[PDB]
């Protein structure tokens, strides 16, 4: 019948369909397997890499502890022995003396006649008695102790450095990439009432450069007379804040953030303690962070544009190379709590090599 | 009687004597005690001092290991779940497909009447079966893994210098202080036949400086034409050897030791692989050792006199700042497979600023050793 033949036709068709789907299914199941294996292979490689390094550190430390502990036991042993032997010998000396004293005292309570007869050699023996042993510190104790001090010194230096790099890396782990920092962009302007008197400003207060000696803003108390500096608006009490500055081919500058209450007097250094968290460009290919002492930074691709990121939650301030989309430097967490604001210096003219302005730029 | 009185006098005298001795004895006994306990206390203080620091470090390391392993576990866990869940689901899809295929294959071999009865439902279900789930990698795996890389990098940046410092301090245990090395003084002269042609030498072969280009020694195959160097005599096959060089206020130079068989061609780097163990002064307050990559050295009190110490047994070569009586650098654990000799460079003239000679200088405690130029 027509309907049976037709149904057989459709059965064949559907069989083909189903078989193609099944084949796709197998390929897919297999590929999932391949990807899983590939993932675990990656993780295992990483695992083994970390495992070697830790194993190596632990080995050296076990060695260090072993030897130090042996050194302690050794010196302890020596000093114990010398102490005991000396105490015993000098006590033998005093005992001998005590007996001779006893004898002479015993000669008293004798009659003259008895005395002359029984005097014996006591006087000679008294006259020739050894002087009790003088304590003299042996060199062996002194060197073993000095070795211990040296190893202690090594330990303090090495563990200090380790503690510091570890903390550095620990803090580095939550610093955002550039786009994350950029999410918190704010609009910053220059507060010209704070400026060093020879600074010159664009009409939009986004740009600042250093003028010559006869180019002077009107004097006022709010100016930083003694530092080539200018502050930015707004201030910050909280949250995450970001801005960007075009530095171009300048040879010198200062960028970062400061406490709003920094002293306007010039006898203070730029440092966290005085309320500054900045990066300074000294000259071409010389950058340093204003840590104490300052940390020199090697930046493979010099920045044409620098990003500044304040994060109040963790109390950290980070710097980004916008040009190369890379991290420059982050100041230690819990540096600050009170209000902050941006700070700028376009540096000195450097003969004419550094006359270009700094420019605050929108993201 | 007179004799009795005398006996009594001598008796009293000796009592006073013995009493002074006893008192001194007591004082010394107690002072000895003090000095000893004082040592025991010092030791113990050192002990507690170190023990606290190490405990802290161990703690920090335990924390890093946990930090890393938590990610390892997290990654392993996610890949595990995604993998099993996906496999199980697609396997269900494929099995459903297999079942429908089974049904159809059974129907196509049934009698016509039997075939016609239930066919519509099976065919509908065949037509409408979903395509088996396609594998798509979740971002989460990619992320957790990248995080794991970040953490391994964390562990390495945190630990590297520290592990290297521990290794170095270990290697330093067989390196004497300066007088220990000076103990092995030997007398070295310059082998002028090996010298870069514009180099100039003293009569006694202890001094070498760089002359101008028109000052040329007679040319020969044995000279270093492409490098401003000269080698020293004698060579060493063994033992511990020490010598000293006055560098004074020079701004550039090379000092150290090399394999006698170094290439006389100038296309090789100064490096262990090429048979060089040297320290180079680049300019004022910049020194580096020819490790690979170079180890840059900052020296607080610059040397006017530099000591070189080869220890062939343990394969080390050490460098000393004689002026400050301090250590500059050590190549440790080197593979020495043959004779070594001294090597020198007076640097370039640098605009008249580095024109002064290097002078091999004897150490005070050595006999004269005349005349050594008869062994060269």
Residue numbers in the entry:
A (entry chain B): 413 to 775
B (entry chain A): 413 to 788
What text does the study give?
The tripartite motif (TRIM) consists of an N-terminal RING domain, one or two B-box domains and a C-terminal coiled-coil domain. Almost 50% of all TRIM proteins - including TRIM20 - carry a B30.2 domain immediately after the coiled-coil domain of the central TRIM motif. TRIM20 is considered to inhibit the inflammasome mediated maturation of pro-IL-1β8, but it can also potently induce the maturation of this cytokine.
Here we present the crystal structure of the TRIM20 coiled-coil/B30.2 fragment at 2.4 Å resolution. In the crystal TRIM20Δ413 forms a clear dimer with a coat-hanger-like shape. Dimerization is achieved by the coiled-coil motifs (E414–N586) that form an elongated and slightly bend scaffold for the globular B30.2 domain (E589–G776). As a result, the presumed B-box domains at the N-termini of TRIM20Δ413 are positioned approximately 170 Å apart from each other, whereas the B30.2 domains are close to the 2-fold axis of the dimer. Within the TRIM20Δ413 dimer the B30.2 domains neither interact with each other nor with the CHS domain, supporting the assumption that the orientation of the B30.2 domain might be highly flexible in solution. However, B30.2 and CHS domains share interfaces between neighboring dimers. These inter-molecular interfaces cover areas between 1710 and 1950 Å2 and are formed by the extended proline-rich stretch of the CHS domain that runs through a shallow surface cleft between the Pry- and Spry segments of the neighboring B30.2 domain. Therefore, we refer to the conformation seen in the crystal structure of TRIM20Δ413 as the closed state.
